[PDB]
């Protein structure tokens, strides 16, 4: 009994993520010898801050987004979560490079981001809500029955 | 053939962290302008730093709690784990609360916090436990016999 | 129907890696006082500032570590990514050590960190590869034929 199909896509997105913030991570520890910003220093010229800073916001939004990208893929579709997940991961790809930069090329592709996840989410809540509300409207209709 | 059912209240509660987890993101945003702490530094007043802070802490824990919660919740209890979630959430967001306004009104929220994590450890490994050793309990019980 | 027994290992270290991380906050929060570094500020002695950074860099890298771990765990083999997972959370614990004495002392087990890492991520793409490719050459095979 295999449950491997219903999952592979929501794995291939999650694994894009993965590749997606190592990216980043070796684009910090490049800009880093490059500034010549010295660790554990985090701070120097306004140019490598800007990139320290570019991978610590996606580093903080990366697990919501692989919480909803799951929770959005198992009670509401795989392939449309999969597909915001591409959204977003791309986005913040150009909100990497924009930030890099500068601060204010960040924001086009912030905004891009910020959809793709807020979609995630509704979509994530909707499945919830298909799974929990009539297991407990019918239950509502319960109480008042009585007759 | 369905898997959904055992495991929705960890998909919720999972979702009300991302919730809670974003509130704190935009509670940081705004902050940020009023201060007027200007990206991308995160230093500034005493206030703003305290809230950035909060922030980062949570993110940190964020997925040690959301491990733990699928952990416990697929090896101990849904209901029970997904109930410590909750209690842990709630903790968080009176950490976030307390911490804005005072460092010290930080800390009953974070020890709530600390408890319900903890506890959702425990029931992992009791799980884990469970799982892994009456199979080797058997099996050690294999070398010593020999009649 | 259950699929417990598919995935323990994986959850085992997943928990490893829970605990190893709540570790490395515990260190950082002794050190806090014995600096006598005050929150929310997070420099001090040079000293105080490798701790906090060890813990951070751990604490980014665990959800992609989480992330492949489950992929490579699902798509390749349990037991092998259970078995990188385990050098990788063990060289992030000689890497957290390291740093906190010399910030040169830290690289050896940050190599042995990046190989088993990169390891898992190879790992969950080859496993990713086996249940996409043959579809996928499989319908190629079907527009050229035609004949
Ligand atoms: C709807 C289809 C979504 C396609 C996502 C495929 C991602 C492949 C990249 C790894
Ligand atoms: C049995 C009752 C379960 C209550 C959980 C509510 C989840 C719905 C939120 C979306
Ligand atoms: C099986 C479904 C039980 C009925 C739920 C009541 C209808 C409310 C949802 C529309
Ligand atoms: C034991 C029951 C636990 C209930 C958790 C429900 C969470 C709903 C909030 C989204
Ligand atoms: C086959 C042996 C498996 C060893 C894993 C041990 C996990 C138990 C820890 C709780
Ligand atoms: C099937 C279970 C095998 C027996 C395990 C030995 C007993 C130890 C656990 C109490
Ligand atoms: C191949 C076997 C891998 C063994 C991993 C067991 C981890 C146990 C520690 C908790
Ligand atoms: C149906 C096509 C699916 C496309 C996803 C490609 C994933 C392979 C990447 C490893
Ligand atoms: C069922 C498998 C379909 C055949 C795929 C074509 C062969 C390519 C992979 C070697």
New interface residues.
């Given amino acids: ?1 295999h ?2 199909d219903e ?2 896509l929501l ?2 997105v ?2 894009v ?3 997606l ?2 990216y980043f ?1 070796l684009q910090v520890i490049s800009a880093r010898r490059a500034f010549h910003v010295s ?2 220093l ?1 701070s120097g010229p ?1 140019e490598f ?2 990139v ?2 570019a991978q610590v916001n996606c ?6 987004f ?3 990208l ?2 959005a893929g ?2 509401f579709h795989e392939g449309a979560a999969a597909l915001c997940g591409l959204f977003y991961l791309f986005a913040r790809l150009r909100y990497f490079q924009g930030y890099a930069r500068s ?1 204010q090329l960040r924001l086009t592709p912030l905004y891009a981001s910020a959809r793709a996840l807020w979609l995630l ?1 509704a979509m ?2 909707l499945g ?1 809500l298909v ?2 509300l009539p297991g407990t409207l019918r239950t509502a209709l319960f109480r008042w029955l009585q007759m």
Same sequence: chains 1, 2, 3.
């Avoid at 580093?59 to 919501?64: G, M, N, Q, T, V």
Wanted: proline fraction near 9%.
């Fill in positions: 009994h449950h491997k999952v592979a794995a291939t999650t694994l993520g993965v590749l913030q190592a991570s660790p554990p985090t306004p801050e800007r320290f800073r580093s903080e939004y990366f697990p919501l692989l919480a909803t799951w929770v198992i009670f601060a989410v994530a809540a919830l799974h929990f």
